[PDB]
Structure 1
Amino acid sequence: ADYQGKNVVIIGLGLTGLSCVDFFLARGVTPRVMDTRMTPPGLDKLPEAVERHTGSLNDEWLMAADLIVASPGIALAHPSLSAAADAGIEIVGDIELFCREAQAPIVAITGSNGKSTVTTLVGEMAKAAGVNVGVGGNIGLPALMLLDDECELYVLELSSFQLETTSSLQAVAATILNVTEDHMDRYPFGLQQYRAAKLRIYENAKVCVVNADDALTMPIRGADERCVSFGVNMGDYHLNHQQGETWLRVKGEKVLNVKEMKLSGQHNYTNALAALALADAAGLPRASSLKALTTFTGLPHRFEVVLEHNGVRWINDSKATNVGSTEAALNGLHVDGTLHLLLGGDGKSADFSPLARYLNGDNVRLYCFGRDGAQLAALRPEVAEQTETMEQAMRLLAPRVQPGDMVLLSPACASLDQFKNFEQRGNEFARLAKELGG
């Protein structure tokens, strides 16, 4: 692509928008930037020479643009952005800009849960093989910052939002790990509209890696000659369970006894399968890929033990921003005493009812906070308490914690109503756990 001389308008003054500003300036194009927020976070980091507009979308700028670059946080359905599309003005996102420039193969990963773990695993498999790898996207390092003529493989975590604005991705290997309700505040045509965004990841992919146990991860025309599957009891990549022992298997052959992994839980074993399938499709050597599965210890804020003291584990699962992610934490969870479960934040219009079946019995207490705290407490009112904030909830539960108990922050909601992001929520939880638990 050649952007010289074009009128380029960027929407969003977050991490993505700032990376796009730098991308265009480095190519001799001065963009303009706007954001609907009155005081967006990147305002102070924006170079002084770049014109900016805040507090609304500016139609004078959008309707004059040759190219609109939309951050994932702005809906294409915004009336001003929809008006620009109606006029035939080209709209792309940062991932599109990246794909147009990338000079190495791309592994592309989406899904409602597991995507950062799988993305990081594939990156570790590449590193173990001695491959110069760039890992980024929705995981938190904007993709345009990865561009490097020495990079030999890119591994991108992609959201549904990013995929909506991407048209030129031709992944060497692509997966949808699973599809469960999320972002319904952005998808007024429901689960299938969200799914449709994710299905874009398979377009022009050389290999598609699908979940044999989740039919919504399959292309609408069905699985085809490009499709490799993973699953629990079936799939090209699957699990074999025996007497307290689980193996990763590929087409009937054992490849790894999961006792060698540092992650645990069935969903992390299927994450390992998906990562291996992607790595195999990208041509990475099997032996080094298996080694990486044994060295990876997990991501911050993803079922992370932040304190184990006095017989109590305090677990930061702040990255559980949807119901399916909290279900993965709860399903199969063993607690000797009482589970003190922190739920709350901005639920994004989700139905929380799938969580109720994990919340029966006498050894569970709920502490519900944030915007949707009342809806979460309604899952089982007789064991639930509601506060405004997570700190209030933690100070309420801490006196009740007994040896053998678990305190689990797995909130099923976004943090943006009260926190900068899920990392700040997790860091605040960890600080409070250390104060209250030691």
Structure 2
Amino acid sequence: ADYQGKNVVIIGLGLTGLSCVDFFLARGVTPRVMDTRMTPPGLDKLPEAVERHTGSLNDEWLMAADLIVASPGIALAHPSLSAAADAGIEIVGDIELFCREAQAPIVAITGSNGKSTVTTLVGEMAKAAGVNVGVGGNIGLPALMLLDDECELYVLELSSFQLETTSSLQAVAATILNVTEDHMDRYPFGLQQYRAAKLRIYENAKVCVVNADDALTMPIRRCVSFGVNMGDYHLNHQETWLRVKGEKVLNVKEMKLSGQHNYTNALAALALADAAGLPRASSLKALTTFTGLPHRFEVVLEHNGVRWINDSKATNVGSTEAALNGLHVDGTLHLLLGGDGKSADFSPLARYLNGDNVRLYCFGRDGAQLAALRPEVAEQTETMEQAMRLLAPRVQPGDMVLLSPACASLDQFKNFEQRGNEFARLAKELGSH
């Protein structure tokens, strides 16, 4: 694509908004930037020659634009964007701009849970094969920061929000790992509308990879499948093995990751890597070396008979359910829940919270709603720190402390990483004498 002479408006700063700014400048186009936040991240990094408008949208700028580059963090349904669309003004996001330029095949991964794990895994499979790979998108570096004509493969995590503004993706391999309720604050037509956004990832994909166990991951109108008991890629319990069409490929005792949902993450990653043409041996090797992502069921302290686990990356109900389903606790589970629940129904969690060995410590915007899952075993505080200091004295040898909050952190924190980092610091303070 050619942007010379166009009036370009970018909505949303941050590293992504900045990567869009840098993208245009390097192409001889000075964009203008707006953000609904008064002091958006990276404002101080924004070059002085770039005009900016913060604290609201600017309809004069939007309606004058030839191209609007919209952060995934702003709804296309926002009246100002709806007005621009009605006017025939083209709206894209960073992923769209990237796809128009990329000169290597793209593996594209979305889903409500497991997408960063599968993304990072496919990256490691490529690295083990000696492929120059760029890994990022919705995690790590924004996609435009990966663009390099020496890159031989791109592996992108894409959110439902990014997908809504992307039209030119033709993935070599694409998957929706699963679809469970999330982002309902952005999808007023409910679960099918959210699903529709993710289904975009399959458009013009060379191979589609679906979850045999989740019908919502399948196109409305074959794909390769992965699953637990069925699928082209499936599990065999003997010990557990990864299998491809009846052939054993890996005894999961060689994996550092554990738990059934990580075994299906492994299958999804292998299916994508196979479709991308990566050698099978090096892909299997990566499965054995990968240790996990920070904030993803991460043991931050195991001391004095107590495991403290940072699962701050659990920003939705289905992710917290993945941590709880099949969870082994010797003594009492001390579960930290809270933040901005994005209008989620938390009741699917209730079935894991029965018995004499669970306590709930509920905080942030939706703390009262979370406490209400089982009031008799729940405490509510304003902050996660308060919750930690409340629970710490009650922790006994055999117990587990688990931050798996089922909510976005954005009511009280910059992001789930800062929430995880704060938890870890507090765990280390409170978990020794």
TM-score range, shorter chain: over 0.9
Deviations 1:212-241 (A, max 9, x none): 0000000001xxxx4100000000000001
Distance 1:141 1:335 in 2: 36
User: 2:198 is paired with a residue of what secondary structure?
Assistant: helix
Deviations 1:315-369 (A, max 9, x none): 0000000000000000000000000000000000000000000000000000000
Distance 1:389 1:242 in 2: 45
Distance 1:281 1:242 in 2: 27
User: 1:209 is paired with a residue of what secondary structure?
Assistant: strand
User: 1:62 is paired with a residue of what secondary structure?
Assistant: helix
The one of 263, 267, 281 equivalent to 1:273 is 267
Distance 2:103 2:332 in 1: 52
Deviations 1:23-61 (A, max 9, x none): 000000000000111111121110110000011110000
Deviations 1:142-169 (A, max 9, x none): 0000000100000000000000000000
- Stretch moving more, 134-143 or 181-190: 134-143
CA drift at 1:280: 0.1
CA RMSD after TM alignment: 0.5
Distance 2:157 2:399 in 1: 35
Deviations 1:100-136 (A, max 9, x none): 0000000000000000000000000000000000001
CA drift at 1:390: 0.1
User: 1:336 is paired with a residue of what secondary structure?
Assistant: coil
- 4+ runs of 1 displaced by more than 4 Å? none
- Stretch moving more, 25-34 or 10-19: 10-19
How much identity, in percent, do the aligned residues show? 100
CA drift at 1:309: 0.1
User: 1:74 is paired with a residue of what secondary structure?
Assistant: coil
Deviations 1:384-404 (A, max 9, x none): 000000000000000000000
User: 2:64 is paired with a residue of what secondary structure?
Assistant: coil
TM-score (norm 1): 0.98
CA drift at 1:405: 0.1
Deviations 1:177-202 (A, max 9, x none): 00000000000000000000000000
Distance 1:31 1:111 in 2: 32
CA drift at 1:242: 2.1
Give the alignment of 1:154-165 within 5 angstroms.
154-165=154-165
Distance 1:151 1:39 in 2: 35
Distance 1:155 1:86 in 2: 34
Deviations 1:288-314 (A, max 9, x none): 000000000000000000000001000
Residue 310 of structure 1 aligns with which residue? Answer: 304
User: 2:19 is paired with a residue of what secondary structure?
Assistant: helix
1:262 matched to 2:256? The reply is: yes
Distance 1:321 1:183 in 2: 10
CA drift at 1:140: 3.0
Distance 2:55 2:242 in 1: 51
Distance 1:297 1:140 in 2: 17
Aligned length: 432
Residue 110 of structure 2 aligns with which residue? Answer: 110
Distance 1:13 1:157 in 2: 20
User: 2:314 is paired with a residue of what secondary structure?
Assistant: coil
Distance 2:78 2:47 in 1: 27
Distance 1:75 1:97 in 2: 18
Q: Runs of 5+ in structure 2 lacking a partner? A: none
TM-score (norm 2): 0.99
The one of 402, 407, 412 equivalent to 2:396 is 402
Distance 1:227 1:272 in 2: 17
Distance 2:16 2:104 in 1: 21
